Amino acid sequence: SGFRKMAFPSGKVEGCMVQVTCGTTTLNGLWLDDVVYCPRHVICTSEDMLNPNYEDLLIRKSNHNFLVQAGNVQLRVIGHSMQNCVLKLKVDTANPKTPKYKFVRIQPGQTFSVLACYNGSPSGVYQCAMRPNFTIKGSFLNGSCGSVGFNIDYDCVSFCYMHHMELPTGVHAGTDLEGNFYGPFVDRQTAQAAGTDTTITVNVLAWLYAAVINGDRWFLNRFTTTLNDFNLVAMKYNYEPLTQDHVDILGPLSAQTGIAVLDMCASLKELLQNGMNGRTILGSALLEDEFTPFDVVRQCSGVTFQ
Amino acid sequence: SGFRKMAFPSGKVEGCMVQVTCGTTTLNGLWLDDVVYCPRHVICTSEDMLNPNYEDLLIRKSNHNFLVQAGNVQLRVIGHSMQNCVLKLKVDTANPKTPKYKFVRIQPGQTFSVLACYNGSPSGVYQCAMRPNFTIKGSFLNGSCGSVGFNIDYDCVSFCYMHHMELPTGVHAGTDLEGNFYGPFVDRQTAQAAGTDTTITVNVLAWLYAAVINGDRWFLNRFTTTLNDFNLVAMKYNYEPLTQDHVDILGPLSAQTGIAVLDMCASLKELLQNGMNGRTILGSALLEDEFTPFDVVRQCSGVTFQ
Numbered sequence: 262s263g264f265r266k267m268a269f270p271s272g273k274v275e276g277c278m279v280q281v282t283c284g285t286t287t288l289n290g291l292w293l294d295d296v297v298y299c300p301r302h303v304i305c306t307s308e309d310m311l312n313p314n315y316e317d318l319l320i321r322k323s324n325h326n327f328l329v330q331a332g333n334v335q336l337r338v339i340g341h342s343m344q345n346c347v348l349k350l351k352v353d354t355a356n357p358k359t360p361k362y363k364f365v366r367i368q369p370g371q372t373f374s375v376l377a378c379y380n381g382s383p384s385g386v387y388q389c390a391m392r393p394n395f396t397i398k399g400s401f402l403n404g405s406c407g408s409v410g411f412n413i414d415y416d417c418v419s420f421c422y423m424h425h426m427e428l429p430t431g432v433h434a435g436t437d438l439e440g441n442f443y444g445p446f447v448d449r450q451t452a453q454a455a456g457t458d459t460t461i462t463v464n465v466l467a468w469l470y471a472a473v474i475n476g477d478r479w480f481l482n483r484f485t486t487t488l489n490d491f492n493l494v495a496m497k498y499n500y501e502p503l504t505q506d507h508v509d510i511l512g513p514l515s516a517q518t519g520i521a522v523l524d525m526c527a528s529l530k531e532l533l534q535n536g537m538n539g540r541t542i543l544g545s546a547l548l549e550d551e552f553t554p555f556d557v558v559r560q561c562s563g564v565t566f567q
Numbered sequence: 568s569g570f571r572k573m574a575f576p577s578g579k580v581e582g583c584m585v586q587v588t589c590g591t592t593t594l595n596g597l598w599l600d601d602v603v604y605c606p607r608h609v610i611c612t613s614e615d616m617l618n619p620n621y622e623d624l625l626i627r628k629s630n631h632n633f634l635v636q637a638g639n640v641q642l643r644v645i646g647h648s649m650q651n652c653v654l655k656l657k658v659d660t661a662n663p664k665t666p667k668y669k670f671v672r673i674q675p676g677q678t679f680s681v682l683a684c685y686n687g688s689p690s691g692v693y694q695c696a697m698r699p700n701f702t703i704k705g706s707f708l709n710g711s712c713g714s715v716g717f718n719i720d721y722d723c724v725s726f727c728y729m730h731h732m733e734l735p736t737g738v739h740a741g742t743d744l745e746g747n748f749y750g751p752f753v754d755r756q757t758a759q760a761a762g763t764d765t766t767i768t769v770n771v772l773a774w775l776y777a778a779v780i781n782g783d784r785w786f787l788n789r790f791t792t793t794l795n796d797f798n799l800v801a802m803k804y805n806y807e808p809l810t811q812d813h814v815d816i817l818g819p820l821s822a823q824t825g826i827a828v829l830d831m832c833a834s835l836k837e838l839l840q841n842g843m844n845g846r847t848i849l850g851s852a853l854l855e856d857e858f859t860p861f862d863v864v865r866q867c868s869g870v871t872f873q
């Protein structure tokens with residue numbers, strides 16, 4: 262029992278991190294087989310980032326302008342190519358530590374682990390969600406670009422995020438591993454403006470099930486609701502609508518609680534309208550929306566802490 | 568910028584985890600050089616755990632009763648020995664992946680990463696604190712025993728925790744890697760009773776500095792206080808006393824905020840007495856005490872998010 266914000270073990274990704282330096286700029290790259298993937302603004306000067314022409318900056322570089330280092334060993338770049346906002350550096354050596362892997366583009370509301378890196382070395386690992394406005398709430402300093410986000414299925418690493426930039430609100434934005442940004446952002450130092458963020462309703466419900474799974478039951482009431490009426494109340498508190506697909510996804514937790522999804526929706530509706538009256542759930546005074554239903558089952562299914 | 572509950576990268580520890588089976592029971596072991604360390608109750612039956620005689624249970628086993636597996640490869644046990652609450656199994660093969668490492672016994676209030684494992688395989692990583700009552704708030708199921716807690720200094724892994732048991736409150740207890748329990752606990756299925764937990768004051772202050780470091784400044788007031796008077800107020804809200812050693816430890820954050828420690832103490836005093844009035848700090852509605860001052864600097868020192 263117990264419930265914590267849990268990340269995936271980072272070992273398989275740690276073996277893929279390298280340092281990429283292009284003259285003035287250094288950031289992290291991801292070394293898979295004989296290709297290093299990194300953000301294309303490694304080729305910018307500070308001057309350039311206000312509105313860079315990347316194709317003109319890349320045109321003026323050859324393979325030898327890119328210094329790639331894996332620990333104490335330098336990797337010779339033998340080809341370079343830009344795919345959307347990502348640079349792909351062909352290297353003379355395939356990574357012996359390349360795990361089984363995929364490139365996936367996640368959907369808003371899904372979670373992943375971030376391995377935060379500086380100079381190609383890991384600093385820490387933490388769990389993030391893709392927000393409905395396609396930002397993430399990470400923890401990233403200067404030099405962190407090229408850090409990746411990932412899920413592990415059993416031996417396969419699904420890379421879904423590469424870190425590119427920070428928005429003044431304290432929020433972060435990046436690309437999938439094909440270089441396409443999440444959200445309406447561009448890799449340029451300029452004001453850009455994101456959608457307003459919303460609460461991931463299906464994830465709050467999954468966390469309420471984890472709370473029940475962990476003995477925290479005070480919030481359960483004796484009511485049910487309809488999907489339509491719940492959605493009318495939730496909409497006012499800036500919650501995403503709950504779909505029947507979401508209800509289906511919560512089936513395992515419901516049938517591992519004997520609490521119908523719409524009954525849990527009636528409990529969440531009462532929490533939204535009345536607040537928590539000083540009480541906590543799983544130690545939190547606010548409702549949590551960064552655990553997916555799969556996250557909860559992945560962590561809890563051996564518990565029952567009723 | 569941004570601030571997250573960050574764990575250490577788990578790769579170096581992942582390479583040390585093995586499965587240990589003694590007849591009926593399976594749990595995790597830690598393989599370093601040619602020794603596997605695991606909880607001694609691997610030798611118990613369910614029957615035995617109500618009040619086991621470990622020396623009599625161990626007396627009846629030989630090296631070949633212990634099945635140790637590292638992935639698909641079995642390791643032959645060639646010697647066994649009990650140190651306090653930990654079993655040490657000498658094996659015929661030294662672990663090629665043994666990192667540089669130490670065994671340390673941490674103090675209450677310090678944090679560490681937990682690599683939660685089942686059947687010798689990693690499930691997830693998360694950050695924990697040793698509570699003042701020598702429990703931790705982890706996330707552990709059946710089969711998780713032998714999971715370890717650790718800090719990484721730069722290439723050296725300091726192992727400080729091995730997981731042994733759960734207390735009905737949802738809290739967890741274990742040993743250092745020399746088999747000595749943290750707190751007044753014994754490895755036996757019986758009611759035992761812990762001290763009452765308290766809030767780690769120096770860690771709350773470190774987190775307030777991180778909040779300042781991250782642009783969250785509303786709670787700063789124009790007052791100062793004395794150490795003695797702060798401690799008289801904090802004592803009522805079940806906070807640990809702040810010592811001059813604690814004030815010294817907060818020096819880097821203070822001199823990286825230009826906020827004197829006693830000025831931050833005056834701000835915390837006002838928060839304790841008046842509450843937060845609906846506001847949040849770093850997204851939290853409660854004060855956080857599971858980040859040490861070193862944790863904050865480790866994560867934040869490149870930020871300034873004022």
Ligand SMILES: *C(=O)[C@H](C[C@@H]1CCCNC1=O)NC(=O)[C@H](CC(C)C)NC(=O)[C@@H](NC(=O)c1ccc2ccccc2c1)C(C)C
Nearest residue numbers: 302401402403404405406425426427448450451452453454
């Ligand atoms: C890569 O390593 C670095 C990581 C940054 C560094 C700052 C601390 N935390 C991080 O995550 N990425 C950058 O420096 C990028 C480079 C460009 C080419 C993408 N630059 C930025 O992230 C800047 N962001 C902005 O200037 C900015 C983006 C979006 C908005 C939207 C609305 C209003 C303002 C706005 C600004 C930062 C400020 C360095």
Ligand SMILES: *C(=O)[C@H](C[C@@H]1CCCNC1=O)NC(=O)[C@H](CC(C)C)NC(=O)[C@@H](NC(=O)c1ccc2ccccc2c1)C(C)C
Nearest residue numbers: 608707708709710711712731732733754756757758759760
């Ligand atoms: C090891 O794998 C396993 C891990 C447990 C399993 C239960 C789910 N979460 C965990 O962390 N450890 C055990 O099963 C140990 C074995 C014995 C020999 C240490 N047993 C327990 O943890 C039991 N704990 C108690 O029975 C208990 C401890 C302390 C108190 C204190 C006050 C009141 C009651 C009390 C009970 C659990 C219940 C299996």
